[PDB]
Design a protein around this ligand. Structure first.
Ligand SMILES: Cc1cc2nc3c(=O)[nH]c(=O)nc-3n(C[C@H](O)[C@H](O)[C@H](O)COP(=O)(O)OP(=O)(O)OC[C@H]3O[C@@H](n4cnc5c(N)ncnc54)[C@H](O)[C@@H]3O)c2cc1C
Length: 367
């Protein structure tokens, strides 16, 4: 069905790599083009969890489920107030897989890279332009040679700049904001907070500020602090830790000294406005050549209720199935069938995550 043709996947994130695996095991000629300089670039961020109905099915189909298990870490969850423990959910043996053991993002990338043929991924390839010819797409990469493909699949994350051939829809700010950071040797550097987590992930919520932490992302503590974007903003400079620290200490002034120590001990902060790529309009039905989008490039949405990578791993599973099992007259029809399913579960996910974002940031999230 892709028989004399090649596929370009733009983006080597967890969705794009998984797309590449599911394609390539059915004999399809696929390359992944990834902006990262090389395979050891550090991926900033929290862990990912794969769920039994969805992301784990992608891994199962790719023959990687067990490997995901070996490298992932089941974790309990503690809910605390702006000082003490209000709920402690330890993981039980029936449930350690039950979905969603946590995996570090570089571990998962390495699992997916290792399952691919040599030179599937081409590193240091930032796609900046796409142009449809007669039969193939010309792909333009910053300061590197151009390439062609019969089929382009954008897997290049929520801020993709190269969507216009699929849709004119734009990314939108949802009105919340997230500040993230990593603390190394947390047992040493934020002891009181590290002891509160006590090996579990921790969430706490107070007066419209939410705090999420994982004390054990390959030995580093990762945390995020989220809140409704201040009307005043922008006004904090994430380059200057002092201005981020002043802002956070003001917002957290009520909170126990263990949380403040977390803010004090952080070397640098990454600030990011929450965004959604809304599945609001149908995508374009006149496309000059086959092209589609999966993962956050298709349906970026707030992460607060756990939605995120699982639905992108389902995208990969449904699209590769449609392209391989070839029950369709054409690639075009294969893509359209995928996009139709994806609009349904993708909209359900977005509604739940928008509704959850509203519910959480209500300043009186009791909750
Ligand atoms: C703060 C926060 C916490 C989150 N927590 C969770 C969670 O707990 N659970 C969950 O499931 N999801 C969570 N998510 C969502 C989750 O991270 C994403 O859904 C997931 O990473 C998307 O996978 P992806 O492959 O589509 O995109 P990405 O991970 O964004 O990867 C896209 C890849 O494309 C590469 N790329 C970008 N531009 C180009 C270019 N022009 N050319 C070539 N390559 C390019 C990038 O380097 C990147 O490797 C969270 C998101 C945020 C923001």
């Amino acid at each position: 069905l892709l028989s004399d043709k090649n596929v370009a996947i733009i983006g080597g994130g967890p969705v794009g790599l998984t797309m590449a695996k599911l394609l390539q095991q059915n004999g399809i000629d696929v390359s992944v083009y990834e902006r990262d300089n090389d395979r050891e670039a550090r991926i900033f961020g929290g862990t990912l969890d794969l769920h039994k109905g969805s992301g784990q099915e992608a891994m199962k189909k790719a023959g990687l489920l067990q490997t995901y298990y070996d490298l992932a870490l089941p974790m309990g969850v503690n809910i605390a107030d702006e000082k003490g423990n209000i709920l402690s959910t330890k993981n039980v043996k029936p449930e350690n897989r039950f979905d969603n053991p946590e995996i570090n993002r570089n571990d998962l990338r390495a699992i997916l890279l290792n399952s691919l043929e040599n030179d599937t991924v081409i590193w240091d390839r930032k796609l900046v332009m796409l142009e449809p010819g007669k039969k193939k797409w010309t792909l333009t990469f910053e300061n590197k040679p151009s390439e062609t493909a019969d089929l382009v699949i954008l897997a290049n994350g929520g801020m993709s700049k190269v969507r216009k051939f699929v849709t004119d829809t734009e990314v939108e700010e949802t009105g919340t904001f997230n500040i993230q950071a990593d603390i190394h040797q947390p047992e040493i550097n934020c002891p009181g907070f590290f002891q509160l987590c006590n090996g579990n992930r921790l969430m706490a919520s107070h007066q419209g500020n939410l705090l999420f932490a994982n004390p054990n992302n390959n030995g580093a503590l990762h945390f995020g602090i989220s809140f409704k974007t201040p009307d005043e903003w922008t006004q904090v400079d994430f380059q200057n830790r002092n201005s981020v620290v002043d802002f956070l200490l003001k917002e957290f002034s009520d909170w126990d000294e263990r949380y403040k120590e977390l803010i004090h001990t952080t070397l640098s902060f990454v600030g990011l406005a929450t965004r959604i790529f809304p599945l609001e309009k149908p995508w374009k039905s006149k496309r000059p050549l086959p092209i589609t989008m999966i993962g956050d490039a298709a349906h970026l949405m707030p992460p607060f209720a756990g939605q995120g990578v699982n639905s992108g791993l389902v995208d990969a599973l449904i699209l590769s199935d449609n392209l391989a099992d070839g029950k369709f007259n054409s690639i075009e029809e294969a893509v359209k069938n995928y996009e139709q399913q994806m609009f349904i579960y993708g909209k359900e996910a977005q509604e739940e995550s928008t509704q959850n974002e509203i519910e959480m940031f209500k300043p009186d999230f009791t909750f």
